[PDB]
Every structure is written in structure tokens, then in C-alpha cells.
Ligand binder design. Sequence first.
Ligand SMILES: O=C1CN(CCOc2cc(Cl)cc(-c3cc(-c4c[nH]c(=O)[nH]c4=O)cn(-c4cccnc4)c3=O)c2)CCN1
Ligand SMILES: O=C1CN(CCOc2cc(Cl)cc(-c3cc(-c4c[nH]c(=O)[nH]c4=O)cn(-c4cccnc4)c3=O)c2)CCN1
Lengths: 296, 296
Amino acid sequence: SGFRKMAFPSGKVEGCMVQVTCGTTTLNGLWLDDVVYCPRHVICTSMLNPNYEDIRKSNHNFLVQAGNVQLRVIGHSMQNCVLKLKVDANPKTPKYKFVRIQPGQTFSVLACYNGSPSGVYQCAMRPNFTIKGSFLNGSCGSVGFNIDYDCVSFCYMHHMELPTGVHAGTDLEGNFYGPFVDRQTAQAAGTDTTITVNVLAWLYAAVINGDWFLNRFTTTLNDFNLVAMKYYEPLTQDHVDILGPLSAQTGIAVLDMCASLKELLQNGMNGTILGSALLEDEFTPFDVVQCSGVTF
Amino acid sequence: SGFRKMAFPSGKVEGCMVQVTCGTTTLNGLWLDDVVYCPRHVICTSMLNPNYEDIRKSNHNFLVQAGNVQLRVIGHSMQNCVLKLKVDANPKTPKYKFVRIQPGQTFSVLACYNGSPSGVYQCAMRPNFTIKGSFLNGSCGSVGFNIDYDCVSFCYMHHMELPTGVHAGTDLEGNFYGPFVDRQTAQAAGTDTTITVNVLAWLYAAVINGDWFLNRFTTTLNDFNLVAMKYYEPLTQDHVDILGPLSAQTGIAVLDMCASLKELLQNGMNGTILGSALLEDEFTPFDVVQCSGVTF
Ligand SMILES: O=C1CN(CCOc2cc(Cl)cc(-c3cc(-c4c[nH]c(=O)[nH]c4=O)cn(-c4cccnc4)c3=O)c2)CCN1
Ligand SMILES: O=C1CN(CCOc2cc(Cl)cc(-c3cc(-c4c[nH]c(=O)[nH]c4=O)cn(-c4cccnc4)c3=O)c2)CCN1
């Protein structure tokens, strides 16, 4: 019983975190096999308008740090906005792949400073391709991940905080989420929306755990999106399908839960669900399927 | 920027989790040096009223499981409600101690099934000595911990879920938090209260991160506890003292923040703080001092 914002165990990722120094700038890097991944803005100084291709550095200009042992850069390259440092092969490398996630998907974040992990928490790729993270200076290079069976699927590396306090970064192959670029120019987070399918999944979690917000109506998929728009991401057929298992375990049809969400949006909560006074949207259907016990 | 429910990295604890089987019952155990700690109710069958001292088992009756390698019990004893299994010495043992925490203190929980970690989350020892955890069957033996410098301070082992859905367990030396006992008899969680000093710490976090709820009044410590009682744990001088650093970093005196909390309790929120629509009370002052960057 209960329901918590739950991160994957961070152990297989702690063994990969390292320090990357270049000049005066130090940030975090990720050590997988003999390659070290980190944000390319680690070669930067001033930054107002860097031409990153601008070839002026040597291998021996990058100091890598794996605890106390110092690593030796033997080759370097740049892939998109990520720097890849070949070094003379981490024994603690797990099974891992790099994946680029869709907005609305969740992951765990291992926040790190000077290559030393500090904490772990959950968050979602918002529909506007920012993440509401928790990051201070020197956190760049912290990564976000999911763990499936025994495989670490890396999906985020932190690069940047925006003026509204949310965060932007890239997949592990260096492609930013959103329209953001790694330079010190004005860039704002776009208008955000609420992740409907995830709110719905969370209502099913509330039901699985034994809880008032239900009602007797239904709605059409179209009529539901009409109301949602007024407050929320349109809900697709594929969303309905994805909510399938949760609907069968609970015997509440997807479109009945939508009618419930409709009412909750129209009348407010009048006073909490799973310990929350607002509609949470950072649990996926997969995340909810914690109520069942999946380990790794 | 940002503020999240943040767990310690769970890596130093994942290396300690094992399986403990006795008869038909399997649960989780903790492997430190050559000793394996687990809930003593693992020797039980029926349970309506066990006399645990009742000596009838052999060493070879306990099957320990460290991944795939099977461990051999060479000695056993019982300390309070925890069983200690001597086995033929975990290479992955960290620096660790056992501490028994005061109510209102927070810790991370590594939820585990069949000795395999499943997830990590934060929670607090409630004033009624329960924890609002997230636990399914087979979670018994999962532990809760804090990490200071490089030392894992274990403070909780899970034993039991109560009918209201909250959870009860022991320190790692087997002493239950609260008046609970490990047998299948009627036992209810007592009336709970809100952890005032932690609400206050969270308001300071809101201020550190740049946020409306402040006002110009003050209050006496006595006058504050008067109002709190009507809604909250009395706030002591020692609490005020503990809030010292946060008050100096922000330039808002403790008793000014209390006046703010007074107003917030009297008038509600009128519509969120740090992404929450209710007054959060599972961050300590220490936890808030994430806004500063402490790693381990
Ligand atoms: O309008 C706007 C205005 N912004 C201007 C600021 O531009 C950038 C661009 C880029 Cl590529 C990176 C950063 C950035 C660098 C560093 C950093 C620098 N040096 C070190 O040695 N260690 C470090 O960690 C840290 N953090 C940061 C701070 C707090 C939380 N999380 C990330 C950055 O955000 C900042 C752009 C967005 N849109
Ligand atoms: O009024 C009341 C009524 N209660 C009656 C129930 O009593 C107990 C007593 C004791 Cl000592 C332990 C449990 C208990 C055992 C097991 C368990 C059993 N066998 C296995 O093989 N694996 C397992 O995990 C699991 N969980 C449990 C379930 C869900 C979440 N987290 C913990 C228990 O809670 C239950 C007492 C409280 N107050």
C-alpha cells in the first residue's frame, strides 16, 4: 500500500560518474567502457556565441577524474552538443543503451557535483521539452535514466538552467530536447501543458490503492478533449490503448475515468488524492504498474 | 534551482540486499560483513500469537541468497524483533552504523522484493511512529537509511503494514518504532500531527528559490504554539535554534516565518508553494540545506 514518487535504484549509474576538467571549468561526465560523455560547453570560456568546431585543444587538455584515480584522455571527438573523451575501460560499466524519449515519459535523475553523486529523484520530460529538475551550479553532466530488467537506458544529460528555473539538456547523443541551444543567449521555455494520460494513470493508482472522485457518467473521446483543451494535452486513441491493463485490473473503462477527470477539472477537489491536493501528472501508466511490484 | 523529494544515492545499500528463506516464507535481508539482518517473523508460520524464543530451528533451516551465489548460515541469534544470521563476509560492505532516529527525521527507503532492489524514495518518521511508505507483500526486510559523508546510517527495517495503509518497523537493532509488536493482532496507528519545524524549513526553501506567503507581522513562540495546536506539533526553542542557518541565509527571523505559517494556516493558500498545494512536512532543515549542494 501507499504511492510515492519512486526513482530506480541509482547504483549502476553511480559507478559511471566522473569529473571532467578543461581549463577553469569542471563539470560531470559519464564513463561507459573506455568513453567519457559530457556537455561540450566544458571547453568554453567567455560562450556569448561559441563556434564549437573551433580544433584548438589537445587530448592532454582534458583532465578526467574517476574518484581519486586520474584518467588519461587518448582521443576526443564531438557528437552534436556532447563531447566524447576516449580514455585508456570502467570495470563498473552496466548493460546500457542510449534512448531519446518522448515528452510525457518519466526518468530518474542522479544529481552530481564534481563527479560525486548527491541525490536521486523522479521527473518527467514536460511537453515543452524542459524538465522541472533540482540542479545547482556544477550539476551539468548529471544524467537521467530508466532501468529495464538489468539495462540502464540513459535518456538525459543536464546542460543548462532556464530563467524560469526549469532545466534543459540533451539525450546522450547530444541532441537537445526542445529548440534550445548551448550558448548564453536569450531562450525561454515555451508554454507548457498537463500530461493527460499520466493524470489518468494516477487516478487508476488512487483506485488500486482503495480510494471518491469517480462518478456514473461517461464521455466521448472527442467531448473529453474539448474540455481538456479548455484547461491539458489532447488524449489520443493510443493513450486509451496504453491505459488498457490499468482499466482491466480496476474494472473502470478508460472513458469512464475521463468523465471523472472532466468532473475533477470542472469542480476542483473541494479539499486530496494519494496525499496530493492537485492533479499529479508525472506518473506514467508504466510507473503505476509500483502498485504491482516490478523489480530490476 | 528547483526543489524535489530527493533520496540519497542507493548504491552502497543495493550491494547489501539479500534473500532470506525459512520454510515457505521469503523476505529481504541485509548483508553487512558476515551477518545478515532480517525481520524475525521470517521463522513464523500460522503468528496469531508467536512465542519467538520458542529454539526449534537449525542453522541449515535458513537459506540465504546473495544474487545467485547461495550463502551458508553458520550461526543464528535473535536481537529484539530482528534475526541475525552469521554466514561464512560481503565484499560490498560500506562504512555504516545503526542509528535510531527521532520522529520528524527523514530517510531514504530502498524497496526490495526477493532481495532485488525495486525503487528508492524519501519519507519521514511520522510523529505517531509510522511511515507513509510504498510497500507490497514481500517487501519486509527493506531498510531505510541516511548517508553522511561516506557512511550509511541505517535507521529502519520494514516489518508490517497497518490497516490504514501506513507502515511500521524497527531500527536495525530490532526495536520497533512506536508501540507496535510483530504479531497478527489488532493494532492501529495513533493520531498523527504535522511536523512544524519541517513545514518551516520548507518555507525557507521556497524563499531560497525565489518565492508571496510572507507578511509583516511577528509572533511570540507561545502565541504561535497556541495557533498551531488548533490545527501541528508544538515548536520548541531547540527547533528555533535548528532553523538558525536558514534564517540567516535568508534574513527572515524564525519567529517571522512562524507568523507567516500562522497566516497560511488561518487563510489557506487561496490557490501553491514549490509546486505543492499543501504544506509539506517531510523536509528537515538539514534536507533543505539540496539548496546548497551537499554531496557524499
Ligand atoms: O535565456 C536564457 C539565458 N541562459 C543563459 C545561461 O546560458 C547557459 C548556457 C549554457 Cl550552454 C550553460 C549554462 C550553465 C552552465 C553551468 C556551469 C558553468 N561552469 C561550470 O564550471 N560549471 C557549471 O555547472 C551551470 N548551469 C546551471 C546552473 C544551475 C543549475 N543548472 C545548471 C548552467 O545553466 C548557462 C540561457 C538559457 N536561456
Ligand atoms: O491491526 C493490525 C493488523 N495487522 C495484522 C497483520 O499482521 C502482520 C504482522 C506481521 Cl509481524 C507482519 C505482517 C506482514 C507480513 C508480510 C509477509 C508475509 N509473508 C511473506 O512470505 N512475505 C511478506 O512480505 C508482508 N506484510 C506487508 C504487506 C504489504 C506491505 N508491507 C508489508 C506484512 O504487513 C502482518 C497487524 C497490524 N495491525
